[PDB]
Symmetry: C4
């Protein structure tokens, strides 16, 4: 169309994306400065104004991008993100609760969706997850079973660490990271339950063994593929 | 046979295994809910009844599976597991001791033996163990020798950490994870035994060096095999 | 030239570099001895004299090397280093501030730039950095966004850990290393902000997931290259 | 010879080595039992007698092995070990100091030198060290320089952690393991030296970066070799 293609050339323009990026880095520096009560005392009204300025400009940009991109926009996770991040930034400050005033900062993550060198890393990193889903499932089932057992064995005398299923989940994650697992948790438990080490040490083994096996399997299964491609390429040349 | 083959078609049926799985996930949600004293106050008799219901249904299922599978059942580790897990769930609640009431929760692990996507992970993970057996042996002998030495050097002034061979084992495992090894253990020791760092730092080196070498050897010995298969496949095509 | 080539033969001589190295190891032993107040009480004037002796000899050496090497000297990072390290050692002790008296010790790092077996390690190690620059950028942006969020959510009640953007950076690095992350930080926070675990646990996941992915990608992308070289070498022989 | 070859057939016999191993496992169980004051009260004279029994039998065995093996014995590290371990076990209990009574336990390590499945692991593990020697050198030089700097910056106000070069070495190793590095060390320092984080965080980076690079280089340099062998094997078949 003609009215359509006018917009589409702006949105798709390098000036557009850059101008957005410069806003982001500008609002980024602003949100770090808003951290200083000294600064907010002096210049606090400027950056509050600079904020919705950026908010609306981002709202407009989001709208245009939807007009240009159509349904392809709501099937693009980076666009979907930019949508919700700017959406969050839109519910009213006063009428809301404080937690939404803080989530405003997530708009700074647009610097990731904008800069393509950044998307690729996030994609690389996230790419390995879908193969781990069954492992994540198993690990969670594991935590679950042990959290139920812990809550029953230790919650009555140790409510802070194990009084509820949720609390026991948390402590077991703590033990998985090994943070103060022994001086902070098991040694105290053992003053009342001498055999507690029979619970947590195997827990520490399974959790540790599994995670390591995950990394070895990721590394070693990848090179098997590299060898598969290499093998066939070399086999082809032999074959002609 | 005819009486035999009637059963065998049910046990081997997809409806069967699914129905078991649905029970498991149902008893799983029940065992998490039984964690709440609020819930047990209100609905506590329902889930206690739902429990032996599931217990007997699992008992029956275990029996049928033995009739169908014969001696092949007691040579299958997944079946052997499901056996003992359901067995444990069968000794009486009142007459027993509390620890068996908790082991009941292990039946939730049937969701692993049932779901084949899960078995494969556990098999993958456990597969690497038999090659490590001599390394596990060496590490244990190592802990053993050092536990005897620690108990003798430090148990008299530090009975909580080193009074007995069992306690010294435990502290040495703690030091292996590095959890509070220095502020919590060696620094206190050194107020009385200034040279204690000569004991634990080499301990921290050997233990650490060995474990890392275990992971490198696992990764690197695997790709040697991948290269062996690849080499011969490629060598064959060259050979014809 | 003739005056030039006289010097150039000394600087480039094996005796030269060795003599410098022997000074370095000598000043190294001296700087460790200067650590003892007993020793400084007895022999403190000797090593203070031995110090500027070495300082000037290193100054002279640096000058000669610049005469010999010309502009190639200021394009060589090892020389540039040796320059600034000896430069630092030159500002006056009395008139300065204590921190420059300590930076004097960095001259001991010349033993690295001197010994070529050492340079190669540092080069190997530093070689992998330029590919990580965008990952370092992303991680820093990440810390930044979360530091702003933390300062806002937790600084008012927890000023030591989160009162300022700088402090929150520091605590988040602490949490990244996992050092006392739960007993020391999140558990205290949760007495006032029960949902704080929703902040730090995802933080602990992203940070951990990313770093691991960095190591796997480094290992696995390298062997892809090794396979590329190997593939073509083998493909060539097939091709003739 | 004839007197020689009589002995040589015993020493080299499978019965010999086994009999030694059975002693070792027997003295091993004895040294764990000697740990119990209950047991030493009851059966303490038996195991003290069983001890020099084993000591002399091991002395004799060591002698025979030297007669049989000649100078080849003192060029064999496993034999050299068994020598010194049994030697240590020989200096007198009463006249000595307690530390030699404890080193007696090292004889249990003969179970490693005896069992060949064990030697191979220790050899594998130790095999990777000689390539790391220059890296170990660099890391130690690094600790050294930073230990001198720490002692000067922080020893006067923090003598326990940094009063001497030896103490600062120890704390820096603690920081390398990250054990309580921040709550236990840097945070206290920063109450007096706000910029202390500029010292330890880069320290934590270098130390961490180097060690990781060591593991990646070990893994990745090994597969380069595997590819080299594979490449030439495959290239040969192409060549005929
Ligand atoms: C630094 C820590 C992480 C920061 C993340 C910032 C916010 C991320 C926005 C949400 C993105 C999630 C969806 C996403 O990226 O998915 C990518 C993959 C492959 O998509 P593709 O476009 O093929 O790359 O599907
Ligand atoms: C090897 C790779 C995988 C490694 C991880 C395996 C999965 C296990 C992760 C567990 C994480 C810890 C969860 C946690 O913090 O538990 C707390 C929550 C909420 O209970 P709540 O009582 O509100 O929290 C404690 C509140 N308190 C202390 C102030 C009274 O307790 C709950 O009710 C939450 C339980 C569900 C958590 C689901 C996590 C799924 C995995 C996350 C996705 C991973 C993708 C990479
Ligand atoms: C065998 C496989 C089965 C899979 C089942 C997965 C789903 C499990 C659902 C059951 C959740 C049970 C939660 C529960 O009992 O909550 C306990 C507490 C509340 O305790 P309560 O005493 O009710 O608090 C009273 C509070 N008052 C006085 C103010 C009224 O609240 C909490 O502690 C927080 C709730 C924690 C939920 C953790 C969810 C873990 C998901 C695991 C997923 C496994 C995937 C394979
Ligand atoms: C690099 C890979 C391998 C890494 C691990 C190497 C093997 C060493 C693991 C040692 C684990 C720690 C053992 C432990 O907790 O020791 C405590 C037990 C029981 O003594 P007890 O006095 O009852 O416990 C202390 C009681 N207290 C403090 C309340 C007075 O002390 C004992 O008497 C138990 C001693 C035998 C433990 C056997 C462990 C064998 C390895 C486990 C299988 C690994 C398969 C992956
Ligand atoms: C050179 C290779 C030799 C291999 C030998 C392996 C087997 C070792 C068996 C010897 C175990 C000795 C155990 C021992 O002495 O127990 C000490 C304490 C009990 O102290 P005690 O003073 O008797 O307690 C009195 C209690 N009272 C007052 C109520 C009567 O009880 C404890 O502290 C718990 C017992 C700890 C046992 C740890 C087992 C480690 C196995 C290492 C396997 C190495 C494989 C290569
Ligand atoms: C996976 C690989 C990458 C892993 C690391 C990712 C990057 C994040 C590293 C963050 C390091 C922690 C920074 C830190 O210590 O923050 C403190 C500083 C100074 O603020 P200040 O308020 O002076 O410090 C606290 C003072 N106090 C507590 C006594 C009141 O706060 C600041 O203002 C400093 C903020 C900028 C730090 C820039 C770091 C860039 C990365 C370093 C280069 C890496 C090359 C390998
Ligand atoms: C979306 C991407 C945007 C990228 C922007 C990167 C640059 C950010 C610049 C903004 C820095 C804001 C610093 C700031 O607000 O400082 C707060 C505090 C000072 O608080 P204040 O209350 O002013 O202290 C008063 C002291 N008195 C009473 C003696 C006068 O001072 C501190 O806490 C120390 C300053 C911390 C600086 C941390 C720098 C992080 C760099 C991140 C780089 C990201 C790269 C992609
Ligand atoms: C479990 C932690 C370590 C335990 C070590 C026990 C005591 C070791 C005895 C001393 C052995 C040191 C010498 C040694 O084994 O060197 C082997 C290599 C290659 O020799 P080769 O005989 O080729 O194997 O040259
Ligand atoms: C990435 C791979 C390599 C990783 C390690 C790199 C090398 C650095 C390791 C440093 C280990 C820590 C040394 C240590 O504990 O320092 C203490 C000693 C003795 O000083 P002292 O004042 O007696 O000890 C403190 C006594 N106090 C607290 C009770 C008053 O201080 C000293 O004077 C000892 C200084 C020399 C230690 C030499 C260590 C060389 C490396 C070990 C061999 C590695 C082979 C795998
Ligand atoms: C640039 C490369 C140069 C390489 C040089 C390597 C060798 C260094 C030798 C210098 C060692 C200096 C040791 C030193 O000053 O000791 C300080 C303290 C003793 O303090 P002090 O105040 O004398 O104690 C008086 C005690 N009283 C009252 C009872 C008489 O004693 C201690 O704190 C313990 C001694 C610590 C020694 C640490 C050795 C590290 C070796 C690093 C190897 C690097 C290899 C590349
Ligand atoms: C074997 C383990 C766990 C499952 C199990 O142990 N069985 C799973 C969990 C994560 C999985 C990898 C990632 O998905 C990334 C990548 C995707 C490619 O598409 C195929 C190759 C690769 C390397 C996957 C291989 C394998 O599938 C892994 C290691
Ligand atoms: C070399 C080390 C330790 C023994 C030693 O250091 N000597 C041992 C301990 C664990 C062992 C691996 C696992 O078993 C998994 C797998 C089984 C295959 O069947 C053969 C390949 C592979 C990768 C094994 C190779 C090697 O055997 C390992 C690394
Ligand atoms: C893939 C990741 C992160 C970027 C991303 O995830 N995308 C980046 C970060 C560090 C990068 C490596 C190092 O630079 C060292 C080396 C340089 C060679 O020149 C090319 C090969 C190699 C192994 C690089 C491959 C790859 O580039 C890495 C793993
Ligand atoms: C590159 C790094 C550090 C030196 C540096 O960074 N330069 C050094 C330190 C340890 C060294 C390895 C071990 O020695 C084991 C083994 C011995 C073989 O003989 C050759 C192969 C291999 C894998 C060695 C390769 C390389 O030499 C390593 C990784």
């Amino acid at each position: 169309s003609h009215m359509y293609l006018r917009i589409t050339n702006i949105v798709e323009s390098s000036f557009f994306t850059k101008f957005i990026i410069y806003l982001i880095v500008l609002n980024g520096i602003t949100m770090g400065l808003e951290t200083s009560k000294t600064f907010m005392q002096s210049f606090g009204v400027y950056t509050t104004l600079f904020n919705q300025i950026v908010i609306t400009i981002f709202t407009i940009e989001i709208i245009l991008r939807i007009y240009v991109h159509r349904i392809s926009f709501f099937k693009d996770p980076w666009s979907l993100f930019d949508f919700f991040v700017v959406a969050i930034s839109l519910v009213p400050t006063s009428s809301g609760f404080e937690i939404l005033r803080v989530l405003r900062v997530l708009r700074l993550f647009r610097l990731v969706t904008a800069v393509p060198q950044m998307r690729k890393i996030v994609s690389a990193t996230i790419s390995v997850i879908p193969g781990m889903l069954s492992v994540i499932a198993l690990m969670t089932l594991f935590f679950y079973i042990f959290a139920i057992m812990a809550t029953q064995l230790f919650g009555e005398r140790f409510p802070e660490w194990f009084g509820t299923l949720g609390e026991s989940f948390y402590t077991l994650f703590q033990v998985m990271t090994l943070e103060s697992w022994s001086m902070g948790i098991v040694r105290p438990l053992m003053e009342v339950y001498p055999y507690a080490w029979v619970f947590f040490i195997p827990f520490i083994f399974v959790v540790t063994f599994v995670m390591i096996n995950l990394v070895v399997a990721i590394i070693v299964d990848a090179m098997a593929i590299l060898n598969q491609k290499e093998e066939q390429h070399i086999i082809d040349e032999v074959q002609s």
